[PDB]
Symmetry: C3
Subunit: 491 residues, 3 copies
C-alpha cells in the first residue's frame, strides 16, 4: 500500500519565458498580446470617418474644385488624410499656421459651413472673374469655392471696408488670403493700384499684409502665389476687413458645432465597410487582450500598445515531457490527474487511482487569477501616442517629439516584458512550493507508519484501505490505530 | 513537556497589498504616502511669496495703475498669479514674447526698479498728456506707470534720438511699446506725422516697428492697440532708441539683482499666514513621507509626487485573526509573544510561557529596515514637473509638454506601486522563511528525543525543565543526556 | 565515516548589493558598468572628425577669412565645435534659423563646395570692394569668402535680376545676406539708392527683405549689421534673386553629397590621434560592458548610458569569511572545493576529501549565465540622448528638452539599478536553494543508516568505503545492504 504526492501534466506545448530559462513548457498559459488586425479603415463606434481620399485638409477647407466631395460634410469620428494627396493648394502658395490648425481639427467632429459674406454683395469689385486654369473645374478654370478672388471693376478698386460679427453662439473658423503677383504689370492689370495692403482686425488680431511682388519659378503653371490665413472668431466678435487690392475674401466660414476629440490619421487605405471600437492607421482591432503590437497611434477603447513580439503569462505549472518538488524529488507529472493541479495517487488491495487535493488547487487558481488581473490593470495607464505634425523649419521640435514618443514606447515595453518574465518565474516557484507543502503535510501525519521512499511516495508499513487513504487526504489520520501493526511490520 | 515554534500576532488592522492578494492584514506596516495639505499659500522658508492678487504679471511689470501694490516689491520666494486676473493690460494690445518672459521670471527672486529715462527729460514732446480712461487711477484717466506715452508738443514731433547705457553691473530688464491707432485722423491728431517708425538697437537687437493703422473692434473702450516689447540689457550695453511717433517710452526699468530660482504658481488662493518648506498651488506640505499625492507642481524640499491613493509597505508579518510555516503547519500567531517577532512557547512541570528568539527577530528587523530605506531612496531622483505656459498658436508644443509631464508622472507612479507590491510579497515570504528555519533548527537538536507533533510543536519523550528548555532555545542541547530516558519512554 | 554537503568559498573580496543587504561578499561577481574613457577626440571607425578648432559653424559656412582650414573639407564622421569659438560672424549680424541648420548638419557627412554665381559675372556692380577691417585676412581687410558684398559701380546700382537653377541631382545649400547700414549717409555712399529691397523666390520661398537703417552700438568695430539667410534648393529648382542694393550675394554653395547621420559635439578638446568605435564629448570608449557612465551624448556602437557609480551583478554565492543552507545550518564554505560550486566532503578509513556535485553546479552556471544575458539584452533599447540647440527666446523649449532628456536618463538608471538589486537577491537565494536541495537528496537516501548531525553532515552508523561514498554522490545507494550493520550499531 502506498500513497504519493504529485501534480498535473497534460499534452500542452504552450511555452513561456523567465529570466533564467527560455522556452519552458507549461500545462497552461495565457497570452495577453493582440497580434492581428483587420487591415481596414472602419466606422468608429458607428460613426464613419471623413476619408478625404485624394484631397488634403487645405484643399478641403478652402474648397479646391477637385474636392467636391466635402462641400458639406457629415459629423466624422476620425479623419484620414493620405501622405502626399494630389488635391492640395491647386494655385501655388502657402497656408499660414497650417499645423496648428490641423491640431485644432484633431479636437473637432463637426463643422457646419455657413455663408458669411455673400458673393453678390460686392457691387463695385468684379467678384466672378477671379479664376485660374491652375484650379480647373470640369475642364474650365475655377478657384477655391469658399473664398472669392476680387479684381478691379471698370479699371477701379475702391478701398474695401467690410465687417462680419459672429452670432450662432458657436465659435467660427474664418479663412482669407492675399495674392502675391508676378510683376507690376499684373499688379495694375488686376487691381490697378500699384501698392496695396490688407488689414485684418479682431479684438485679438491686428495684421497688415502687403503683397510681395516678385518673379518666382512657376509651379502648377502659375508664377504668382496665394498666402492663406485663418482664425477662430469668438461667438460675439467682429472680424473687420479693409483693403485696396490683392484681397482673397471669405465667402463661406465654418461653425465649430461639436468638439468631440478625434485624430487625423495618415494612411493610404480606402474605406473598408466595417464597424469597430479601436482603429489604427493600418487596420482595426477586435480584441479583449490588454496589450497589442499593431501600431502606436490608436483611437477608441484600445489595448495598450507595446513593441513585444510575444507576451505570454505562465498560469499552469512546468509541464513534464527552486523548492524541492516539481521536476525534483518528484520526477514528473501525472497525465492521469485531470480534476486538479496538485493531488495524490494511491495503491492498495482494493483501489488504484488519483485524487486531486482541491482547495489547494483552488488556493492556487485564486492566486494566479489575482496575479493576472493585477498585471492587466497595473498598466491601465500607459503613454498614448498622438500624431503631431511639423513643417520644414520645426525639425528640432519634430525630432524631440519623436524621441519622446519613442522613449515612452520603449519604457512601457520594457516594463511589460520584464514584469511578465519575473512573474512567470515566481509563478512556477509558487507551484513548486504548493507541491512541497502538500508532501510535507502528508509526511508528519505518517511518521514511522510509512517508509519515505524519496520520489514523492510513501510505502505503508501497515495496510491502508480506501478509507484510510481518504483519512490521509482529509488530514485526519489516526496514527495510534496503526502504531502497533506498523511497529510489528518493521522487521 | 513540549516546546513550540511560533510567531508574533497583535490586534492590528493595518492592511497591505501584494500581486496575489489584496487587503492582507499585517502586525506592522509603514505608510509612505502623504495625503493631506494645509490648503494655504505660505511663506517658503520664511521668504514670503509675491501674491499678485488681482494683477497679472504684465499689469505688474508695466505698472497698471490698479496695480499699486507692486510699484516697489520685496524679494519673493515664489509668485502666485490668478487664472484670469482682472488687472492685465488695461489699454488693449499685446505683450511680445510674454511666455518667454514669464519663463525668465521663474528664475528671479528680486527686481530693483530704477528710473533710466526720467519723465522730465522730454523737453520737446509733451510727456504728461498720454493718458486714457481705459486705465483709470482713482476716477481719472491714467496709464502704465513705468512707461510714458509721448504725444506732439505744439503740433510737432521732432524725431527722437535717445540712448541708455547699462551700469550697475547687473542685468537690466527694459520695456517699451508702440501705439497702433484707430485711423489717420488720430495718427496726425496725436503725432502729426502721417507715417512713423521706431528703431530699437542694442548689440544684439535690430528692430524697426511701424504702427499698423486700422479700425478694430474696440475692447475696454479703446479701438487702438498698444504692442509692448521687452529685452534684457547686458551690464555694459546701450539700448539706443530712435522714433518720430507712436513711441511708448521706458521711464523705469528693472535690475535683476538676485536670481534665486523659483516658480509662478496659478492659484485662486489668498495668502495664508504660515511658513512651510514645501508649497503646492493648492496647499502646503508638512511631511517626512518620501511620497505625496497632493499636486504635481511643488517648490521646496518636497516628497516625490505620485498618483497613488494608498502606498503602504509591509514590515511585520501576516497577522492572524510560500514556505511551510506561517498560516501553514503553524496555524496562527501568538498574541502572548510581545518581545519579538519569532520565538518559542514551552510547557513543563514548573513553567509555561513565551520566549522570543531575539537575534533572529533582530536579523529580521535589520533586513526590513534596510529594505525600506532602499525603497525611500532608490527613487530619490524622480521627475519634477514645472509650470510652462504657451499661447494660442503653441497648442502643439503645449500638448507635447502635457503628454510629457504626464507620461513621467504615470511611469513613476507605476514604479512606486509595483515596487511596493513586489516587496510586500517578498517581505511576507521572508517572515515565513525565518519561522521555518527556526523550526528546522529546533528539530535536528531533538531528533528522536521528541515526537514532532505537526503544528509547530515538539512533545518531549523525556522530561525537560526550564534549563533544558533554555538549552534548546540556546542551541546547546545535549542529546545523549536524555537518549536513555527517552528511548525507555518509547513504549 | 561521514559525508557532508557544502559549497564553494574562495578569497574573493568582490562585493554586491541587494535590497536588504549592502556590501555582501560573493565568490564571483560580474561588473557590467564601464567607468573609464581615454579622454580624447578620435577618428570614429577610421573616419576623422571635422574639428572646427576656433571657428564656429557659421564662420565655417560663410567662410570667415580666419577660417581658412575649412575652405574645402573632407567627409567627416562627427563635428566638434567649441563653446564660445572666437571666429564666428566677424562682421556683426545674425544668422537666420541657425539652429535648424545645425540640426540639418547633424545628418550630413559630406559637403562639396561649388561656385554657382561667379565673382566676375557682376559687370555693373563693383564686386571686389565689399571689404571690412572687422574681417581681416593677414593684416588687411577682407570678407566672408563664399559670399560677395556688392557696392555701387560709378555712382549707380542697377536693379539686379539673377537666377540659378539646380543641377547635380543633389540637394544644394545656398546662403545669402542683407546689409543693415548705420545711416542714410552710408546707405547712399554704398548703394546710392535711398531705399532698397531683396526679393528671394524659389518654388517654396517668397521673401522681401528691406534694410533696417538705424544707429546701433558698434561691436567688433562696426555699427552696421549683416543678416544672413540660407535655404536648401531641390535638385531641379531655381533660386531667382532680385535687388537694388544692400545685397550680399552667393558666390559658393554646398552640395549635400552624402547624408550619413552624425552629431555636433561641444568640446574644448583638440584632436587626439586615435581610432575608436564609440566617442563622447569628453573622451572615447573601448568597452564590452553593456552600460557606461561616461557621458549622455555618444556616437557609434556604444554601451547604454546610466547614471550609476557601481553596477555589479552577483554570479557566485555568498562568500564565507532564505532557504536553510548557506550561512545557515551549514555555517561556512569550503575553501578546499575548487572544481564546482556545490558538492560533498567525505571521511572514512581510506580517504578524506572533496567532490563537487557537477551537473548541479552546471545547472547553476547555466541559470546564472542566462540571467546575465537577459539583463544585458532586456535593456537593448534605452533612450539615446541627442544634442539640440536653442536660442535665447526658445528657453521654454530648451528647458522642456532638458527635463525630457534627463527624465529618461533617470528612469533607465533606476531600472538598471533596481533590476540588479532584485536579481542579486534572487541569485543568492538560488544558491541557497541548490545547496538545500542537494542536502535533501542525500538525506532520503540514508535514512536511519546515518545520524543527521545538523551541520550539513551525516555520521554513518555503518562503515562506508570510497565506493559506498561514490554511490551516495551518484544517487545509487543501496539501503538494504547496510540495513543490518547499521541497525546493530544503533546501541
Ligand atoms: C456685434 O458685436 C457687438 C459687440 O461689439 C454686440 O453688441 C451687443 O448687442 C446686443 C443687442 O443685439 C446688446 O444687448 C449688447 O448691449 C451689445 N453689447 C455691447 C458691448 O455693446 C452685438 O450683439 C453683435 N451683433 C451681431 C449681429 O453679431
Ligand atoms: C475525513 O475523511 C474521513 C473518511 O475518509 C471521514 O470520516 C469518517 O470515517 C469514519 C471511520 O473512519 C466513518 O465511520 C465515517 O462514515 C466517515 N464519515 C464520512 C462523512 O465520510 C470524514 O467525514 C472526513 N471529514 C470531512 C469534513 O469530510
Ligand atoms: C557705455 O558702453 C561703453 C561701451 O560702448 C563703455 O565704454 C567703456 O568705458 C570705460 C570708462 O568709463 C573705459 O574704461 C572703456 O575703455 C570703455 N570700453 C570701450 C569698448 O570703449 C562705457 O563704460 C559705458 N558707459 C556707461 C555710462 O554705461
Ligand atoms: C546556553 O543555555 C544554558 C542554560 O539555559 C547556559 O548553560 C549553563 O547550564 C549549566 C547546566 O546546564 C549551568 O550549570 C550553568 O549555570 C548555565 N550557565 C549560565 C550562564 O546560564 C549557557 O550559559 C547558555 N549559553 C550562553 C552564551 O548564554
Ligand atoms: C531648370 O529648371 C527647369 C524647370 O523649371 C528644368 O526644365 C526641364 O529641362 C529639361 C531639359 O533640360 C526638359 O527635359 C524638361 O521638359 C524641363 N522640365 C520643365 C517643367 O520644363 C531645367 O532642366 C532646369 N535647367 C537647369 C540648367 O538646371
Ligand atoms: C554509480 O556509482 C557507482 C560507483 O561509485 C558505479 O557502480 C558500480 O559499483 C559496482 C559495485 O558497487 C562496481 O562493481 C562497478 O565497477 C561500479 N561501476 C563503475 C563504472 O564504476 C556506477 O557505475 C555509477 N553510475 C554511473 C552512471 O557512473
Ligand atoms: C525556442 O528556441 C528559440 C529561443 O530559445 C527560438 O528560436 C524558438 O522559436 C523557440 N521555439 C519555437 C517553437 O519557435
Ligand atoms: C466705366 O465703365 C463705363 C461703362 O460701364 C464707361 O463709360 C467708363 O468709361 C468706364 N471708366 C473707365 C476709367 O474706363
Ligand atoms: C468582434 O468582437 C465583437 C464584440 O465586441 C463582436 O462583434 C464579434 O463577435 C467579434 N468578431 C469575431 C470574428 O469574432
Ligand atoms: C478591502 O476590499 C476592497 C479591495 O479588495 C476595498 O473596496 C476595500 O476598501 C478594502 N478595505 C477597506 C477597509 O476599505
Ligand atoms: C507753437 O507754440 C507757440 C506758443 O507756445 C505759438 O506761438 C506757435 O504758433 C505754435 N506753433 C504752431 C505751428 O502752432
Ligand atoms: C510641522 O513639521 C515641522 C518640522 O519641520 C514642525 O514645525 C511642526 O512640529 C509640524 N506641525 C505639526 C502640527 O505637527
Ligand atoms: C561598504 O560600506 C559603505 C556602504 O555600506 C561604503 O561607504 C563602502 O565604500 C563600502 N565598501 C568599500 C570597500 O568601499
Ligand atoms: C561713370 O564713369 C565714367 C568714367 O568711367 C565717367 O565718365 C562718368 O562721369 C561716370 N558717371 C557719374 C554719374 O559719375
Ligand atoms: C580596445 O578594444 C579593441 C577591440 O575592438 C582593441 O583594438 C584593443 O585590443 C583594445 N585596447 C586595449 C588597451 O585593450
Ligand atoms: Mg506528480
Ligand atoms: Mg507537469
Ligand atoms: Mg488624402
Ligand atoms: Mg518520497
Ligand atoms: Mg505562532
Ligand atoms: Mg500573526
Ligand atoms: Mg493674480
Ligand atoms: Mg510540529
Ligand atoms: Mg560548505
Ligand atoms: Mg562561500
Ligand atoms: Mg570651435
Ligand atoms: Mg546535518
Amino acid at each position: 500500500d502506498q500513497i504519493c504526492i504529485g501534480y498535473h501534466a497534460n499534452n500542452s506545448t504552450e511555452q513561456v519565458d523567465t529570466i533564467m530559462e527560455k522556452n519552458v513548457t507549461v500545462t497552461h498559459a495565457q497570452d495577453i498580446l493582440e497580434k492581428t488586425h483587420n487591415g481596414k479603415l472602419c466606422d468608429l463606434d458607428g460613426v464613419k470617418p471623413l476619408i478625404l481620399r485624394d484631397c488634403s485638409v487645405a484643399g478641403w477647407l478652402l474648397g479646391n474644385p477637385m474636392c467636391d466631395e466635402f462641400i458639406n460634410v457629415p459629423e466624422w469620428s476620425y479623419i484620414v488624410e493620405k501622405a502626399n494627396p494630389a488635391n492640395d493648394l491647386c494655385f501655388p502658395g502657402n497656408f499660414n499656421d497650417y499645423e496648428e490648425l490641423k491640431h485644432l481639427l484633431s479636437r473637432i467632429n463637426h463643422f457646419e459651413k455657413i455663408q458669411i459674406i455673400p458673393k453678390s454683395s460686392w457691387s463695385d469689385h468684379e467678384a466672378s472673374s477671379g479664376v485660374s486654369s491652375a484650379c480647373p473645374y470640369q475642364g474650365s478654370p475655377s478657384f477655391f469655392r469658399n473664398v472669392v478672388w476680387l479684381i478691379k471693376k471698370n479699371n477701379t478698386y475702391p478701398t474695401i471696408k467690410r465687417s462680419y460679427n459672429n452670432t450662432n453662439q458657436e465659435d467660427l473658423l474664418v479663412l482669407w488670403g492675399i495674392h502675391h503677383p508676378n510683376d507690376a504689370a499684373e499688379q495694375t492689370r488686376l487691381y490697378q493700384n500699384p501698392t496695396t495692403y490688407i488689414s485684418v482686425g479682431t479684438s485679438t488680431l491686428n495684421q497688415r499684409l502687403v503683397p510681395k511682388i516678385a518673379t518666382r519659378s512657376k509651379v502648377n503653371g502659375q508664377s504668382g502665389r496665394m498666402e492663406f490665413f485663418w482664425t477662430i472668431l469668438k461667438p460675439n466678435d467682429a472680424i473687420n476687413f479693409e483693403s485696396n487690392g490683392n484681397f482673397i475674401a471669405p465667402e463661406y466660414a465654418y461653425k465649430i458645432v461639436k468638439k468631440g476629440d478625434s485624430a487625423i490619421m495618415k494612411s493610404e487605405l480606402e474605406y473598408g465597410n466595417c464597424n469597430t471600437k479601436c482603429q489604427t492607421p493600418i487596420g482595426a482591432i477586435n480584441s479583449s487582450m490588454p496589450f497589442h503590437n499593431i501600431h502606436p497611434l490608436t483611437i477608441g477603447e484600445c489595448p495598450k500598445y507595446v513593441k513585444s513580439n510575444r507576451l505570454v503569462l505562465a498560469t499552469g505549472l512546468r509541464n513534464s515531457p527552486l523548492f524541492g518538488a516539481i521536476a525534483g524529488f518528484i520526477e514528473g507529472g501525472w497525465q492521469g490527474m485531470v480534476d486538479g493541479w496538485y493531488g495524490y495517487h494511491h495503491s492498495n488491495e482494493q483501489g488504484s487511482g488519483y485524487a486531486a487535493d482541491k482547495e489547494s488547487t483552488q488556493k492556487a487558481i485564486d492566486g494566479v487569477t489575482n496575479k493576472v488581473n493585477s498585471i492587466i490593470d497595473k498598466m491601465n495607464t500607459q503613454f498614448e501616442a498622438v500624431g503631431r505634425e511639423f513643417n520644414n523649419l520645426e525639425r528640432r521640435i519634430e525630432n524631440l517629439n519623436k524621441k519622446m514618443e519613442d522613449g515612452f514606447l520603449d519604457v512601457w515595453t520594457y516594463n511589460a516584458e520584464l514584469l511578465v518574465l519575473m512573474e512567470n518565474e515566481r509563478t512556477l516557484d509558487f507551484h513548486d512550493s504548493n507541491v512541497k507543502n502538500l508532501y510535507d503535510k502528508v509526511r508528519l501525519q505518517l511518521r514511522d507508519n510509512a517508509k519515505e521512499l524519496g520520489n514523492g511516495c510513501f510505502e505503508f508499513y501497515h495496510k491502508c484501505d480506501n478509507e484510510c487513504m481518504e483519512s490521509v487526504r482529509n488530514g485526519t489520520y489516526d496514527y495510534p490505530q496503526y502504531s502497533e501493526e506498523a511497529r510489528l511490520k518493521r522487521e
